């Protein structure tokens, strides 16, 4: 068991592979799939590779009851080996929609597997989110400085992507969208723009009902949201400084390069302005020939 | 069907009301053909040595071209002649051909049972698609005038419909079905939309995409709520390409002429995730405001191409805006020559048939020149497009009526000559062969009549089922009922002589 | 006697296609191979949903290298979360030759034929998907008698035309006198789409975030010194043109490389750049202020 | 304030170019002289 933790890279292979795996074994309908996931562990981005299902039994009124066959697994183990010898166990995804509070049981019974502290990766099946649609978690065993005892409980890390030469070129392969949520032209930026704005727009607005909470729905201080809260306090922007005079002294540099390139575009548009009009002075003459 | 009833007790002479099914007027029409058809027999045995029926593409080709050519009269010089050949295919190409003698012997209703009778049940069991080819063969004989018809086919039909089928059952309820769809167009049967709904229900690979085909051909022009509810929803439940694609063009046929009522399927259409739904939305909109160039329908057509990116959808979208402009055909080589100029395959491909469509009736020498080039490009799907859709434009004109009209001709020549060019290429000229002499140069396209102005059933359905060949090559056999009869005949009007 | 043979097409999902290309990559230049589990549906669907290796091998492709042995164990490891199917064939990779089938890749083939009809190989290239193309062809064994009696026409029944090859020599060789090839798709979800697309996070921290401007200033910097190369460029080539046949006028006054058109380029494509600079910083002043 | 103008004063030369451009153009392509 490693604490050796910071990130989680997901290959695109896993994402799907856990959609089709939820509905092949068909415990859905706010029944859950949980299968085991795979990959490398013992490294600060943890690199997930594969995964796949186990066999899983869900009862639906008690979500603190449920089935796991221990056996299987290390049944499975020696064929991941087989596809890639370094794929070893490193968690268990859950389908979403998002973290539940069953979940630390059956975090427990899989630690006799992992050699690093099981990963939640939650795969959202809706596709829900505002970056990649998955969240993850691990779970860390650590006191608390409010008075109560030593807790095990799921801190997030980010979702990203990494992937393979083979996966990467697969995955242009398969799709044909030309995408709005990466560059690309002018005007595919341009709704790269607006989405952002609105995405600081979207988030910010969901602190303000979470400080809002604490003292009106009763949810606890929690101190390790609120110290970085602090910290973008103290880096935010100011008024009226030598620094944010600069920025204007900048704009009107870089813009006035643009002014140039633009009249630069225009040169070369009125020679074709004078060559076509070259082959209408042509053209003249074949028509008075007639 | 409902006006005929009327007369009968208003009181009239049994002579009109005989006319009004149009039996006679059947009768009629046969015998000019009878008479003055020219065929070109050196021209059947140069195909029959160009293109092999030991190659079953090769005798697709042929199979449909001769039939084409000898349309409109029961003549069994096709048979005799290549009496050796046509047994050598097998698979749907020997399906192909036993449904190109019902292109020859298309009408002689006295006579329809009596040259199809050596292939009919009841003394063919060697081959399944015989049995089952003979059966659409001679829906097309008695397309339109099949009432009678209609019940010794459904005898058939439900028998098939309580199985599952064997493979010789699926191959023989297959032709059944595209059949009774011709026999029964325009009836307005529920009885038959029943019997092809058992079909559906079962679940059958090829004969489930034809039953699909053979309700759409019986209700047209209903806008019925029910056969359209039920059709969409099984395209989702089958994974089926063949069965899903039946469903979306049918589909098309049955809202045929409300124009703004169809509105809410295509919403639906277009709206769906899947490909084939917005290939079949392309073709609802197309026979919805058929023969009316109004300014939406047209709008929503020209967007759908450019911005998808699936293959079949780009090219439904472009052959649907031919119907919708049969109204002013001649806007329809400025507004395509832009689609052409995209050199992309598949949208060039419908180009050439929005041409051929929409143009099918007198010469332009623009219409030409714009296919032309579209006969040499590389990619060898244009090729064939282009050339079907010159035959379908200069049906019937002389060489001193417009010179074009030889050069063109040896130009399809040429390419089956060749044996050093692709076989895609002279399948297209080959084909384009028959329609270009079909009738044996006596009947053109009517796809809007000038004997009222008024526009014409028959020719926008056999059309748009013609557009299918390229993923079904039976179904070529349709464009027989676009070729309405060109001449004056006279009658003397005391006994009808 | 006999079972008809016809075009059919080879859909191989997103999800089977990728655990392919990421194995065939990792063990290359060894061959790997393994079996394909699917479904076969209506004549014309080879449908491959997912896949999984068989052990590693030295000796290559073979039925040595398979078994029905190390099939059992990993089937019955499937069985157990039932997500168990029917095996629709197999797959193997070159290490680094185009797609076609040995003569002991056939005789893999023949093994398998005998127990589904439509029984499919394909072969992998994960070593020529270093390009923007996946390079897997499938291919299928035609029977003995029916390749003398001229059945190749038999097996261009049910498409329309979709016949492209990518290789010939090789490929053209085996598919005379052996086999008959079948085309590739590629199934996805929408879901799948969106998966595929993103490899970033910056879609909604692309206006928030940008390069920093010292890298600006470098590329600014570069492209007025450009334009200014491709101005002489292009003044040397309008002394004349108005002498006919463009061409001739692009050698001999040098408008080789058409510097006329190559100025335009550098002026959009650092004309963008600019814009992007702008829609970030515009977006931190208003939304932050 | 000012790099603004310029830049607004080139779009408008750009556009009278386009329009000016395929007018007499079309008139010639249009016009038998073939």
Known sequence: ?290 | EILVTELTAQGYDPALLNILSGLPTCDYYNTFLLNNKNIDIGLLNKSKSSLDGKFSLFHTAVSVANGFMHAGTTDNSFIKANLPWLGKAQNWAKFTATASLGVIHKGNLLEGKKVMAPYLPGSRASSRFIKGGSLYGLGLIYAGFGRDTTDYLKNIIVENSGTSGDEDVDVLLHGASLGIGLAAMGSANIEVYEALKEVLYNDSATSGEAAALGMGLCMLGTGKPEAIHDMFTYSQETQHGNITRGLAVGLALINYGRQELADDLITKMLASDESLLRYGGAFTIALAYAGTGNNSAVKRLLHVAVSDSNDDVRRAAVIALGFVLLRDYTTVPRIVQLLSKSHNAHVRCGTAFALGIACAGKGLQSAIDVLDPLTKDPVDFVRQAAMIALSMILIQQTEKLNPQVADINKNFLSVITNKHQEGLAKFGACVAQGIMNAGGRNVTIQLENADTGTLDTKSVVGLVMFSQFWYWFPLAHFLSLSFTPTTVIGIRGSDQA | TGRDDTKETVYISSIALLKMLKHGRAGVPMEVMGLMLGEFVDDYTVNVVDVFAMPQSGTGVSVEAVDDVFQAKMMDMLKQTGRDQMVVGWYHSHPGFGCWLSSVDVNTQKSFEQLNSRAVAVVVDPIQSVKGKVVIDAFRLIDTGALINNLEPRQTTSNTGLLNKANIQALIHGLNRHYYSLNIDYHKTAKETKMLMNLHKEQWQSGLKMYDYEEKEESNLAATKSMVKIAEQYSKRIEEEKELTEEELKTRYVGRQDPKKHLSETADETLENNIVSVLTAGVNSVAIK | QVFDERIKFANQLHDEYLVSMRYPEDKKTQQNEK
């Open chain 1, 1 to 290: 068991m490693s604490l050796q933790h910071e990130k989680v890279t997901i290959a695109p292979l896993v994402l799907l592979s856990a959609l089709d795996h939820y509905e092949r074994t068909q415990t859905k309908e706010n029944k859950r799939c949980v299968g085991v996931i795979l990959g490398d562990a013992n490294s600060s981005t943890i690199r997930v590779t594969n995964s796949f299902a186990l066999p899983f039994e869900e009862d639906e009124k008690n979500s603190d009851v449920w089935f796991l066959d221990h056996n299987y697994i290390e049944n499975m183990n020696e064929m991941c080996k087989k596809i890639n010898a370094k794929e070893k166990l490193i968690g268990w995804y859950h389908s979403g929609p998002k973290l539940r509070a069953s979940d630390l049981k059956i975090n427990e019974l899989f630690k006799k597997y992992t050699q690093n502290n099981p990963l939640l990766l939650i795969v959202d099946v809706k596709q829900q989110g505002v970056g990649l649609p998955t969240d993850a978690y691990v779970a860390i065993e650590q006191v608390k400085d409010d008075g109560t005892s030593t807790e095990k409980t799921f801190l997030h890390l980010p979702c990203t992507i990494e992937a393979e030469e083979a996966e990467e070129i697969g995955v242009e392969h398969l799709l044909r969208d030309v995408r709005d949520q990466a560059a690309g032209g002018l005007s595919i930026r341009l709704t790269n723009q607006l989405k952002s704005l609105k995405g600081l727009q979207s988030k910010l607005k969901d602190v303000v009902e979470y400080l809002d909470k604490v003292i009106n729905k009763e949810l606890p201080i929690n101190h390790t949201i609120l110290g970085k809260l602090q910290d973008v306090f103290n880096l935010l922007p100011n008024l009226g400084t030598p620094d944010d005079d600069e920025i204007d002294v900048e704009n009107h540099d870089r813009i006035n390069i643009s002014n140039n390139l633009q009249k630069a575009l225009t040169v070369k548009t009125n020679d074709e302005l004078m060559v076509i009009y070259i082959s209408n002075l042509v053209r003249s003459i074949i028509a008075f020939d007639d």
